[PDB]
A paper describes a structure:
GH29 α-l-fucosidases catalyze the hydrolysis of terminal α-l-fucosidic linkages. GH29 α-l-fucosidases process their substrate with overall retention of configuration at the anomeric center of the cleaved fucopyranose and do so through a double-displacement mechanism. In this mechanism, first proposed by Koshland,, SN2 displacement of the aglycon (activated through protonation by the general acid/base residue) by nucleophilic attack of the catalytic nucleophile yields a fucosyl-enzyme intermediate, which is subsequently hydrolyzed to yield α-l-fucopyranose together with the released aglycon. Crystallographic analysis on bacterial α-l-fucosidase confirms that the ABPs act by covalent modification of the active site nucleophile.
The crystal structures of α-l-fucosidase from Bacteroides thetaiotaomicron in complex with compound 4 and 5 provide strong evidence for the covalent binding of cyclophellitol aziridine to active α-l-fucosidases and by this virtue the validity of the cyclophellitol aziridine design for activity-based profiling of retaining glycosidases that employ the Koshland double displacement mechanism. “Aglycon” here reflects the aziridine N-acyl moiety to which the BODIPY tags are grafted in ABPs 1 and 2 and which is designed to occupy the space normally occupied by the substrate fucoside. The 3-D fold of BtFuc2970, however, appears not to provide sufficient space to accommodate an extended aryl aglycon pendant to the atom, which would equate to the ring oxygen in fucose. N-Benzoyl aziridine 4, bearing a bulky aromatic N-benzoate group, is about eight-fold less active compared to its N-acetylated counterpart, 5.
Residue numbers in the entry: 35 to 479
């Protein structure tokens, strides 16, 4: 039992309506947009395979010369209403936007630095326009914010002298100033998702992370803050030295989701995964043939996976320099939206069902105790195994899309075969189960 001033604050999951909304949303989109979209992974003739948003680093570009990319920031095809229509049609209930990435360029007209949209040919407050457009479509907006900033000389990677400490202190002042600014210009913000918080400097300043969390919660009622922000008194990040989760939800699982058999611990807190369509490209990269690019079904599989274990999933997009989306991303959003329109009752506002994982796919649980079977892998046996928790029985099964009744055969105490539909749906599909919890056997139902 280690005593701590800047360790965890929340007892269990938050159950206030704004957290319920953050959670019930389930499906988000990420936007990574900034100066990196101009060179798109290429610099001085060399195409770099690393993440396009890190190209300043891959190509060893000095800050002064990286930031002169602002002179070419002119996204004439940008239209925030079109971006919000795209998100709505994909079935997202929220969008997270890079307000400022590591390069330090701000997508709003910050009064605290010259490296902003204000000082580009385009001049306009892109951040404000997107906030309005998404909110007009009924889509919540979350702000990604990089603490690490390659544009501000005051930033330190570690505190190695009194000078470093004085310097980093003003940098933290500067960071609070931008945070207050985003919270006061854009009060409909629902979440701040921090990044670039892993350096020794930040870990040494745990108190500052707790302060930022508190500051923003005073400024924006109900606002959510990701675990990635937080370091405790010992420099321990995400979960404090007593294993307790800091911030409002766990953020991680980029490129590997929690294991549905081994990582059931995650159902005990709120959490959010974010993913890329290629293997590791968040900002726009001009050449997607360099790594594996996920198909719509592989993405939909990850989204349902997340919801089945009590978490959110956010699919990333890296808009072109011009303010439009490349065709792969338009195809992806469309394909996702088509499936979500059909099967979304087993994703939106669903949660962990407390059933043993089976091979055919994933269970999710609705707000009224519906139990959905989302089938990704069709058994040649024509039978979907359903093993129930103690005291739970399956009274009915129904194909979601048509309401057709589906046979359920009991095979042992607590196990059934649910038949596959008479006609193969030809895509990942949903069977809704009606279940009954027996009088006073303890269970989550």
């Amino acid at each position: 039992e280690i005593p701590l001033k800047y360790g965890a604050t929340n007892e269990g999951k938050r159950q206030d309506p704004a957290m319920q909304k953050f959670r019930d949303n389930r499906l988000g989109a990420f936007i990574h947009w900034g100066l990196y979209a101009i060179p798109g992974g290429e610099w001085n003739g060399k195409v770099y395979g690393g993440a396009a948003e890190w190209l300043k680093s891959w190509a060893k570009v000095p800050a002064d010369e990286w930031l002169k990319l602002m002179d070419q920031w002119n996204p004439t095809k940008f239209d925030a209403k079109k971006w919000a229509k795209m998100a709505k049609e994909m079935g997202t209930k929220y969008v997270k936007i890079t307000t400022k990435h590591h390069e330090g360029f701000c997508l709003w007209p910050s009064k605290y630095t010259k490296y902003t949209v204000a000082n580009t040919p385009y001049k306009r407050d892109i951040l404000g326009e997107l906030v309005k457009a998404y909110n007009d479509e009924g889509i919540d907006v979350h702000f990604y914010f990089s603490v690490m900033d390659w544009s501000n000389p005051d930033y330190r990677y570690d505190i190695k002298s009194k000078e470093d400490s004085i310097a980093f202190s003003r940098f933290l002042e500067f960071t609070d100033n931008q945070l207050k600014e985003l919270a006061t210009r854009y009060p409909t913000v629902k979440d701040f998702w921090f990044d670039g918080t892993w350096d020794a400097s930040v870990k040494k300043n745990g108190w500052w992370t707790a302060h930022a969390e508190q500051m923003l919660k005073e400024l924006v009622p109900g606002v959510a803050i990701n675990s990635r922000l937080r370091a405790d008194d010992k420099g321990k990040r995400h979960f404090d030295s007593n294993g307790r989760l800091m911030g409002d939800y766990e953020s991680g699982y980029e490129r590997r989701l929690p294991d549905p058999v081994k990582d059931l611990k995650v159902t005990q807190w709120d959490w959010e995964a974010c993913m890329t369509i290629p293997e590791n490209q968040w900002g726009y990269h001009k050449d997607w043939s360099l790594s594996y690019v996920k198909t719509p079904i592989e993405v939909i599989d990850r989204i349902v996976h997340a919801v089945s274990m009590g978490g959110n999933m956010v699919v990333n997009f890296g808009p072109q320099a011009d303010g439009d989306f490349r065709p792969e991303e338009k195809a992806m959003a469309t394909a996702i939206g088509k499936w979500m329109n059909r099967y979304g009752k087993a994703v939106y506002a669903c949660d962990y069902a407390g059933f043993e994982k089976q091979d055919w796919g994933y269970y999710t649980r609705g707000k009224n105790d519906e139990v959905y079977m989302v089938v990704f892998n069709q058994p040649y046996s024509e039978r979907l195994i359903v093993k129930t928790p103690k005291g739970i029985t399956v009274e009915k099964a129904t194909l979601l899309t048509t309401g057709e009744d589906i046979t359920v055969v009991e095979t042992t105490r607590n196990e059934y075969n649910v038949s596959v539909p008479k006609k193969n749906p030809g895509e990942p599909y949903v069977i809704q189960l009606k279940v009954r919890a027996a009088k006073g056997t303890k269970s989550i139902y």
